[PDB]
Symmetry: D3
């Protein structure tokens, strides 16, 4: 029971999948988990706990932005005993060879936010994911015939950047996807001694075309979730 | 319809009160607006439009953190003709002479975010509110017989900051309350040509203790609302 | 007597108007204060104390730049019981709809100085003026039938800046005037527990042309003075 | 030939093992490489090219510090077609559980240098290694019955830092070892489209551990070829 | 004729000595120059031109602070053909071996100001004096039996630092004297292609005693001026 | 012995000439020094101590970059009693009037490194040389009928900078030559109470010019002894 979560120790699994959209968490709960129960509803950030193939799993939205997800992941780790957090969201692409519906795994996350500099005496803290979590995800994807890209994500503070001059830079230094919280989650995981990983599905790209079908799009998003769910089972072993 | 708001031009009033919590927006629409109709629920970010003493007005959540509210205030200003934004949120107090439930009006807002430096070529942009709006709010207050301090708020990126020594600095410079989005809303208001004001209810004390569930609905949180709603009326004259 | 002011406690009123130019202070004492007596001349920084409609009040120059006025405002606040400081200076306009002789009231002040970052642990401190003082000045104006915009000023370190592209940035964010000390006076006022306000007369246009010698004395520079002096009277009530 | 490498395209393998110490490149050529030949000597920074189990491989030191390794890394990549760079060196530890001689693999590298900020418009660039190369190093170590820690490294610009308070910070955020070039090499790999990885053995808080690291590095390349 | 100087080309010598105090410039003029004439009086910043041993020399105050002296030295160089500027002021000492009345020559100047970073793409610009000017000063002092110290000065933006933690740092890295404009003058000299040098006499030190006599103090200040005047004669050769 | 110098107090003179290239230390020992003896070899960074006209002097390279030279500079100063350090190297020019082979003396050194900011609480530290040493170098060059420019140097962290726009800035503020360690050495000298100077010959915009620089450096020490 924290100011942002009305639950108690035991209410969450030691592993939590986190989409940015609270309505997405209910979607995941109802689609992949059995015997799911809502364990939080404060300010509409729905959280759920259930089981995936006999394994206890939790799913809860983290909202948009590093400041938002930082609050939730921190409380989950320090107040609910959560050991692993897997963010499952969307991202925009800047690289020409990265196409719509590609599954991206952020082994690292670049950012224009100042949270990690505030943490790291103003120096460069490399916000990285937990290695084992990354390989578990890579292997799970492989078992599903889904080949994922592993690299750098860029966590933006401004979805509407005042000057898109930064997109050429991201492209130049090869970041795979553009989103808004990976660098924040990794900073939190490092600060409170937990493990985190964010997986994204490319929903848009700079230099668009047509629009792609929702069915195929929704299919890839489900694969991403399965990869996430299945990767934790591999970790349990 | 914008990326995060499934609404059409005209569904929102030219003035929108915005708490961080979607459920508080629902509460405000139910408790203060006559004939309130829901105009958004995309990521659970409820938006409503109704009337207050014949005046058409809207209320919608903006989520936690500068990145979140920046998205919403921006789409509202550019795609829904919104002219004024009044944040009605909660905050933490750092000064000893500031008690819980106190109402604070942020004429200015300090921040540890990099967002404004990214806009102002890495210099110091003074994130200020629209003068008339502050005066309207101060007058509305006096007319309702409610106390309210006018001053600097501090918009933090990390609700759980690793640097507690900064609270001493905030206090020394008399910042009235610690919240998480004022400086970002003022930056958007300026970047996109709109006006804004942040009103907060001290929901906890950084040096002492906090509160719970009342943040979604409390007479003092009702005072903040009355002031906000009444100040709009004064602005129309 | 302080390092830069050869005066004793009581030689200054609790309110001091301060232009950058020592000669303008002399002009103000001669043209507006009854029974004005000189209380300082150490580095040629003339200070005077007299009365305006029975109200005891002082006027003294603060020199050019944040480092200069920081010295004077500080000694005044800590060693001469000064409670209020009203800067009555000149500035450059960057917006097209701002003509020469216009009166600007800085509720806020952006800056490229590092002074406030040194005070606020390298974060963004919103250098703001005392709310009541701004309101007093706005009311005094209306009562004198003089126009006056209220907004952000930009306090520059270099009058001859190598970065002209920054004027475009200032303009974009609607800063009302470019001067050189407002943000420093507000920082001192906050650091040393006093209140302050900056009123400026647009003495030139960054995009167009300037003026000369009138800055030491002009009806419009007289308007700034009347507003300042009258606002004090309103503050006393 | 480039300003710091008197050689031509083809002289270097597409993979280059890089120790800090120049003296160690020759020791690696004679000890692990077959049919090695000298391909550089410009400033005593000796380079060699040979094979390891048929695989073409080169060895050459990079010098101490980001500025130094950045020069060699960049030149090899843009002028000699090098596709992968594996730095093999030593580091100091700040974590109690990290013991001397432990093998550490830098999936990422923090730094107090401005080098990447200058590249990333003053924002935070996560200097990271290539995942496959990381995984290959881990699998190779395992096959050699060696436990390798995978985490963050810290690339210091000042070996003798004026403030030791930063070591508490490194320990708090779990960095595995303190060295001086990983973040620099990662920046270059990112900037010029190539892959990189640095493997280090904890020297403070030897030939065997050193030979172990090279074996790991070399064996990881063959795995990567699969 | 610029907004800060009411003179015309030819009114100044191609070499100007500059104390911070306008009243000090009149002192220098009347004490060492013959046939001296006031060539500026705008905002009280007295400037004078005369001859020293047949050589045409000018003397004018620059006010306190980098922003102030930056305006004057810039206009002198670009609008009055001034080739050399020699600042002659006072400074405080932090080193134990640097005693009261020591003559310090700033071959370099450290600063907490942001002016040079703004000029130098945010990197480290080493603000240095003109070598020949430095050796001319060292040799002149020698001819007068005055041995001067040559090293780094620290140009502060805040005479009243919010946290004197920087004084141990200055001492640690060996800066000889603490003043307020050297780094600014050198930045200007570099930007507009001129030559500058600042010479200071230690007027105070951290860890005081007695107070020293004004006569001896005034004697050393005069020596500093003679060194300045005489060093330019050596440059002419 | 220190981490990077296997020697004892007394082995080094109180003055040390430091070229970047290790190979150049031995060439200087055999060409200009009398009775030279080897005093270091830890990473091929050879050091020698001998005399020049009776004066005791040492020579040893510092490597490329601030991080590298900072290590050697610091160790020599705090553990071997070195009082003066003279770096002798090459640089690139951005000013039209500065010609190839010109001799440049860095009275000051700008930089894009964070090294001094970390030392100076993130403020601006003017990395400068010792005045006397500067004047001695100038007087020695004169006596050798050589014109030496005295001004600012720029110590780059990235030999291959991602933005060339900075070279216009260097030219605008009159920096004489672009190199990679002057600001680093000056920081160390300041931090540990010693004196330093870097002299460079413009290599781009040779043995003779190089020998000229060493002669200048060596002759400047004798002047400094007066
Ligand atoms: O192109 C993009 N840019 C920035 N964020 C996102 C996102 C994700 O969607 C949300 C905002 O649209 C954020 O929570 C972010 O994680 N998807 N596509 C993009
Ligand atoms: O003590 C506090 N610190 C930081 N933010 C807040 C808030 C506000 O509440 C939300 C997080 O609890 C944010 O939207 C923030 O603006 N209330 N109390 C505090
Ligand atoms: O266009 C301008 N730019 C910067 N400062 C000023 C000023 C003010 O006048 C003085 C310098 O001319 C400073 O004190 C500054 O506040 N007037 N016009 C301008
Ligand atoms: O404790 C340490 N600190 C910093 N660097 C190192 C190193 C490595 O040794 C060299 C400097 O001694 C650097 O090139 C660095 O990679 N080993 N142990 C340490
Ligand atoms: O101890 C000191 N600190 C900072 N400045 C000064 C000065 C000089 O005196 C003026 C302020 O007192 C400034 O113009 C500065 O150059 N003298 N002594 C000191
Ligand atoms: O044009 C140049 N740019 C940067 N450094 C140098 C150098 C020197 O050469 C080495 C790198 O090539 C560095 O150690 C530096 O001191 N010479 N010419 C140049």
């Amino acid at each position: 029971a924290t100011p942002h979560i009305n639950a108690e120790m035991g209410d969450f699994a030691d592993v939590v999948l986190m989409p940015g959209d609270p309505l997405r968490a209910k979607y995941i709960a109802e689609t992949f988990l059995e015997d799911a129960r809502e364990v939080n509803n404060v300010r509409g950030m729905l959280g759920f706990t259930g089981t995936y193939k006999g394994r206890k799993i939790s799913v809860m939205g983290h909202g948009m932005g590093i400041p938002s997800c930082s609050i939730y992941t921190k409380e989950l780790i320090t107040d609910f005993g959560v050991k692993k957090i897997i963010r499952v969201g969307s991202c925009g692409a800047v690289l020409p060879h990265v196409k719509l519906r590609d599954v991206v795994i952020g082994m690292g996350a670049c950012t224009d936010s100042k949270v990690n500099r505030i943490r790291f005496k103003d120096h460069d803290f490399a916000a990285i994911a937990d290695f084992d979590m990354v390989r578990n995800a890579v292997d799970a994807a492989k078992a599903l015939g889904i080949d994922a890209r592993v690299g750098n994500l860029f966590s933006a503070d401004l979805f509407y950047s005042p000057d898109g001059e930064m997109f050429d830079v991201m492209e130049k230094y090869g970041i795979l996807g553009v989103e808004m919280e990976a660098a924040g989650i990794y900073g939190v995981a490092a600060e409170f001694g937990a493990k985190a990983l964010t997986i994204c599905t490319v929903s848009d790209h700079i230099r668009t075309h047509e629009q792609t079908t929702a069915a195929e799009r929704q299919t890839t998003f489900n694969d991403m979730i399965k990869i996430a769910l299945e990767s934790v089972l591999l970790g349990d072993k």
